[PDB]
Structures are given as C-alpha cells and as structure tokens.
Design a binder for these strands. Structure first.
Ligand code: ZN
Ligand code: ZN
Ligand code: ZN
Ligand code: ZN
Lengths: 369, 101, 77, 81
DNA sequence: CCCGCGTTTTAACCGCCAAGGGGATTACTCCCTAGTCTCCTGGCACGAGACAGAAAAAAACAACGAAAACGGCCACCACCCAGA
DNA sequence: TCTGGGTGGTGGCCGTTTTCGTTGTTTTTTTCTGTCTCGTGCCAGGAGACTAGGGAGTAATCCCCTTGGCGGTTAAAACGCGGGGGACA
C-alpha cells in the first residue's frame, strides 16, 4: 500500500514542478451503476437476454453564444429587513441517548428536561433509576433514613408525602389513560404505538392486499372491468345505489357503461362513486360514511360557533330513562329510537309532532315579524 | 357443564407417530421444498433447470436423512432421561455420526 | 418490451375474457339491465321496457369472416 | 428466491420427527432442523451441480442427484442407477 | 414450555394452457491417443557416515493442598433519636 | 423518665485471599547410537519419433419436458388460549 501521498509533491521550494496523481483503481470497478462497473460494457448474460437474437447537425454547441446573462427584477439582493431499541418512556423507535449504566433507552425529547441532540451533556449520562440506585446504595436502612426525613421536611403536604417522594426514583413516562377510563367507552381502542383509534377508523390493510395484488386488484379497482363483482356477495343480488336506484355494470364488451359502486362501511348501503361525488375507493385511512347518516359534530353559527357533539358510547353504566313523550322534553341530541349521559328514548310519533309544531310555530313567528 | 374431549398430552403425539410410521408419502410439502432446492442451487450455478425426478429424488433423500437423524436424536434424548428432543440432542447425534466436527 | 408496457388492458385480457366471457357473466349483465328497469319500475314508470340489449350489425361481410374463422378452427380440431 | 428455508414449516418438521418416533419436540428444534437440512441440501446439490456441469448440461437430472447421494454414502433406490 | 383443540388465513395442489430451452440423437471429420522400436537417464537398491534425537540425571518450576490474615456478613452491646 | 427504633462500635462466624510445602513435570546439558540422507552403479521404465484408427468435437435437427402462469378448492399452516406434564434445579 503506497502511502496516500499529498499530490502536490513539492520538489525544491514549493514549486510543485512535479506531481503525483492518486491511483484510481477504486471508484472504478465500483460496481455501482445499477448494473456492473461504469467502465465495463454490458455483461454476456445481459447481452444474451437482451439482444434480439450526423454530428454536423447538432445545434448544441451554439448555445453559449446566444444565451444572454439575464439580470432584471429585484436583483439588488433585496438588501434590508446491549441497549434497548425502543424508548422506555413512550415505547417507540428513534434516536436514543442510551445509558452507559442502565439498559433502558430514551428519546432525546422524552427525557426530563428534554435534551437537545446537538447540545448533549456528553460524557456519561445516568437514568433516574441508576442515579437513585447510586444515591441509595440499595440498602433499606439508609433509604429509610432518607425518605422518612423527606416526609418530615414535607409535613405541610404530608398527605401527599410519599407521592412526592417517589417521583425522584422514576424515569420519565409518556402519559396514557389507565384502562379503567377507556373501558367506559367500548368504541375506542388504542393503536399500534398509541394511535388512539375509534370505530370510525378503517381496519388497516396488509402488505398482501396492497403490494402483492396483481394487475387489476386492490386500489386497482380502477384499471379494469375485472371487478364486475359489485353484486351482493351474500345474496348474489345486485348492489343497488341509493340515488340512481340501479346497478351499472355494462358488459365485458362495453366496460365503459359500468359505473363504480361502493358500500358504506357503517351501514352497508351501496352508493355510486358518481352519485356521492368521489374520485376513488377509500380502501385506507378512515371508514367511509354515507351522506345518509346523522351528524356527530353539528357546528352552529347564530359568531356563536356553539359546538354539539354526540356523547360517546358508554358501557352497558349506560341509562335509558323512559319519557312521558309529547312536546318539550328537550334532549341535547342523543336519542334511542324505540317502537348524566342518559340516552333519551324518543319513539316515533313524538318526532312527527315535534317537527310539525317546530315548523308551524316558526312560520307563525315569521308572521309575527 | 360438559367439558370437551381433550386427549391427555402425549396421546395424539403417539397416534401421529403410529400414523406416520405406517405410511410412506412425503411429509414435506413439495412446492416449498422445490423452491428451497432451487434457491440453494442458485449459489452454485445460475439459470439451472431441474428434472422433476431430480427434485423428487432430493426430497426423498432429505426426508430419509431427517427421519434417521430424528431417530438418533430421540435415542439421545431418551439417553439423557428426557422425553423431549432438544437441539443439543441433534448436535450430539450429528457429532457422534461424524457429520458435525 | 415497449409496446407491451403500453398494453394495460390487453395484458390482463386473455384472462379476463376467460372469466367475464362465460354463461354466468353473460346472464348477469342482461339480468342487471332488467333489474335496473324494474327498479325504475319500483321508483319510476312501471310499464314500458320491452328489451334490454340492442346488439346492432351495421356491416355485413363480417359474418363471413366469423364463419371463415369457425371453419378454420373446425378443420384444425 | 428468498427466505425459502422457512418453507419447511413447523408442522412438516413435526411430521418428520413423528416418523422418527419422537413424542415431544422442543421449540428450538425447528430452527436447528432447518439448519441441518440446509447443510445436507448444500452438500448434495453441490455435487449434483458438479455432475451436471461436467456433462455440459443446464438441467440437473435425477441421475446426477443419485450419483451425488451415492458419492456421499447415501445410495438411493428408485430413481435409476 | 409444549401439546391439544379451534377458528382463520394462506398457499399448496391440481389441472390446464402456451412457449421454447435444451436434452438427445445423427452425421462428418480430425485430432488425439494407442501402439511400437530405439534410446537413455531417472529412479531404485545397496552402502555408509554422521548428527538429530532418544535418554538420562539433575535443577527449576509449576501445578496441588493446610493456618493465618483480611474482608464481609450476622449478632450483641452501647449511644443517639423518637415516641409514650 | 422509660420503652422502642435506628445508628455506630465491638465481637463472632463465614468466605476469600494468601501462604506454605510437596510432588510431578519441564528444562538443560552431556552422551551416543542408529536411521536419514547422500553417493554409486545398473537397469528398466519414460521419452522420442512415427503410424493408424476411431473417440470425441462440432454442427444441425427435433421433439420432450422444464418453465411460467392462471384460476378454483380446500387441506394445511398459523395464531391463540389453556392447562398439565415434563425439565430442571
Ligand atoms: Zn420516547
Ligand atoms: Zn441508566
Ligand atoms: Zn352508511
Ligand atoms: Zn348511484
């Protein structure tokens, strides 16, 4: 191995009269071409597989002599004016300041205080647990002599004494609701890394359903008449769209007459993509909802941007206290149609009368004006 | 209030032993083994073709060798006063056979 | 590979023909047009439709080509 | 062809063990068996491909496999030879 | 930790179609190998001689096994702090 | 002022370290002997030169079967729950 000579290789007094070009050898035969090295022609295999078994007209050099350096517009610069692979705090992946002592690992923005990646304390960093381990020596008598003293010095809040005490010995932890509150709402469900999901989120598709589907399958229900199976699978009947009131599939000899149809994720009502104006099947993200369902957020302007949300579904804690019906009985919006988060039970005729008198007494009020 | 009919652990294992010592059909699925054979051969020569008979011969030889190896492995496992075969048993069988160094 | 690359609806063809050119699909299309008419019978005029396909043959002299192809196949089978 | 050794599923190894008279199988046995099978196939197919190359053929014939096995001391009957 | 049983999912298996790479064979021709006579020089057998190594005796040292010392843990006593 | 709890010091017991002598083995210098290596001579196996024949190389043809792909059925593989019997300390 010849030494990496400094090319200039000055001879007498820095005259650099003699040079020594570096040996290339490498950066050559590099085999980084998307094929074989750039200085070599196509391989015999590629040849066999691939083969099939006027410079005077170049008006390119005449470009520098017709390109005019252009400087208009502002142009003044407008001068002026071993170690864990998941974060032990949030249980996710990323860059980590692995502890020299503890096997646990944290993000840089999950520690306490958060630490800037470029402004690390460097040297050796200990987690709260190992700091406490070395501060306590793991024996119980000294820990007692320390913690009882802490409690004594915190008599003003002795009621909270040990809660205050135990914080110091705990590493930072991402906040997550305990299960005894999420369970109150059966609809909700945690995600893969805490992506807190609801009933409105579509079940994720697998790689088999996206990356392996052949030409004409998956999101590819846009490339062929192949998915003519917009026929009701369970019954074998035709999925009829709610608006046009017909199913369009044309023929294999007239695929241009077919119209895409989709079934709502919530209530399996078929809709034409061209009837509910849409450009694609969902297949991803959230669950599609017809334009035929009742609103959840009812943003109202009377600005008076008063919000109305439908109470989240409660565990079967849920109450349905029966009305005596007729007008009044102002529920917020919650209803359970029947033949403290109390889902009111409005039956059928009450709605009729309530709408009837709403619109009529409003028209008489308009008369009042 | 009824309980299903769960066979005691080790019963269905013995039934399977009897069934598979009684029969002769190949136990490894054919397509996965063919794919494995081609993948292994890809490291010795590219664009190789295999006679179906060649793949079948390889499968028969491999299955016979594995069955004999498992017989020896079971013998070693029993020698250690065990009933379960463990990787150390296979290693000892191969070492005594002279296959593994 | 060039002209093949631009052959989207033709590379899947020859497999979609096998599926969609069959008895089941052929009755399915006609039955569906009939169902659409009967749905605009449930929700639109009841009596009117007396057909569901309108196959047209503007050009003669194609029948003879179909017959020639059939004859060739017959002679080959 | 990638990750085809896992094509020798756990139940297939279980069946092979049962034919071998094994009643109880440890969980770690499957990976060890896959490794052993890979070694055996590598040893056999090496010689089979050597025979194929010597014959100046692009196709590995069953007789090449039979010769390879006979060379290794595992004579196989029923495929010629 | 592994067997057993049960839903649930995957892909193996079958069968059927289309394509052509390459196995297998045939015919032609020549270049390579067998065969043979004559020539000789490399390899073998025999003899010899001497130094590499076996042996050996003695010393050095390098693994095996007891009581004292040091350190750690447990128990008891003394002192200090906290509670009654 | 008395009793209980905790800390500090002292004593006792256990574990570890060292500390020592004892055999056993390794190393070192001297001796000497017999097998390894070299030389000599002969001969027979290898080389050289030449002829003859056919085994195999090479081109051309063809017809098998190996590859690829595609769809339908469903058998098998996977994943999970649960318990108990086997590993193992
Ligand atoms: Zn984090
Ligand atoms: Zn730490
Ligand atoms: Zn809907
Ligand atoms: Zn529509």
């Amino acid at each position: 191995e010849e030494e990496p000579k400094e090319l200039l290789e000055k001879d007498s007094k820095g005259n650099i009269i003699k040079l020594n070009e570096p040996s290339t050898i490498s950066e050559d035969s590099k085999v980084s071409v998307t094929g074989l090295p750039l200085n070599k022609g196509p391989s015999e295999k590629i040849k066999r597989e691939s083969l099939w078994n006027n410079r005077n007209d170049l008006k390119t050099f005449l470009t520098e002599n017709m390109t005019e350096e252009s400087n208009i517009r502002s142009t003044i610069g407008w001068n002026g004016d071993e170690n864990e692979d998941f974060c032990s705090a949030c249980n996710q992946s990323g860059s980590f300041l692995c502890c020299d002592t503890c096997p646990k690992s944290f993000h840089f923005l999950c520690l306490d205080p958060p630490i800037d990646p470029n402004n690390l304390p460097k040297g050796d960093w200990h987690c709260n647990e190992c700091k406490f381990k070395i501060f306590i020596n793991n024996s119980m008598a000294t820990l007692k002599k320390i913690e009882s003293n802490f409690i004594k010095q915190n008599n003003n809040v002795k009621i909270f004494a040990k809660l205050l005490f135990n914080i110091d010995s705990h590493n930072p932890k991402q906040f997550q609701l305990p299960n005894y509150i999420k369970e109150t709402f059966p609809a909700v469900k945690t995600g893969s890394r805490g992506q807190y999901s609801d009933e409105n989120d579509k079940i994720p598709l697998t790689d088999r359903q996206l990356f392996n589907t052949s030409y004409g399958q998956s999101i590819t229900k846009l490339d062929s008449y192949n998915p003519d199976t917009h026929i009701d699978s369970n019954s074998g009947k035709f999925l009829i769209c709610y608006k046009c009131n017909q199913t369009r599939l044309g023929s294999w000899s007239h695929p241009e007459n077919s119209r895409l149809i989709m079934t709502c994720d919530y209530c399996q009502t078929p809709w034409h993509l061209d009837c509910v104006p849409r450009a694609s099947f969902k297949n991803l993200g959230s669950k599609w909802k017809c334009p035929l369902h009742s609103p959840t957020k009812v943003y109202k302007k009377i600005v008076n941007y008063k919000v109305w949300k439908k109470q989240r579904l409660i565990n079967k804690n849920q109450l349905y206290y029966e009305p005596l019906q007729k007008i009044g009985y102002q529920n917020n919006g919650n209803i359970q149609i029947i033949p403290d988060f109390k889902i009111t039970q409005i039956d059928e005729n009450s709605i009729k009368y309530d709408f009837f008198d709403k619109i009529y007494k409003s028209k008489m009020v308009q008369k009042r004006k | 209030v009824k309980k299903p009919h769960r066979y005691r652990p080790g019963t269905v294992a013995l039934r399977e032993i009897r069934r598979y010592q009684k029969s002769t059909e190949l136990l490894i699925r054919k397509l996965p083994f063919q794919r494995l054979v081609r993948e292994i051969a890809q490291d010795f020569k590219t664009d190789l073709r295999f006679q179906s008979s060649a793949v079948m011969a390889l499968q028969e030889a491999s299955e016979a060798y594995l069955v004999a190896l498992f017989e020896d492995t079971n013998l070693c496992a029993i020698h250690a006063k065990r009933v379960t075969i463990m990787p150390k048993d296979i290693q000892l069988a191969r070492r005594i056979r002279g296959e593994r160094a | 590979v060039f002209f093949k690359s631009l052959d989207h609806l033709g590379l899947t063809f020859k497999q979609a023909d096998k599926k969609l050119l069959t008895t089941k699909q052929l009755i399915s299309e006609i039955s569906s047009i009939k169902v659409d008419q009967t749905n605009k019978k449930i929700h639109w005029l009841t009596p009117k439709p007396k057909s569901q396909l309108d196959f047209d043959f503007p050009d003669k002299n194609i029948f003879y080509d179909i017959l020639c192809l059939a004859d060739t196949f017959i002679t080959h089978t | 062809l990638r990750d085809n050794i896992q094509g020798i599923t756990k139940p297939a190894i279980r069946r092979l063990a049962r034919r071998g008279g094994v009643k109880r199988i440890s969980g770690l046995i499957y990976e060890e068996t896959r490794g052993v099978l890979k070694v055996f196939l590598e040893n056999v197919i090496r010689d089979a491909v050597t025979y194929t190359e010597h014959a100046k053929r692009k196709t590995v014939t069953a007789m090449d496999v039979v010769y390879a096995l006979k060379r290794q001391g595992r004579t196989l009957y029923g495929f010629g030879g």
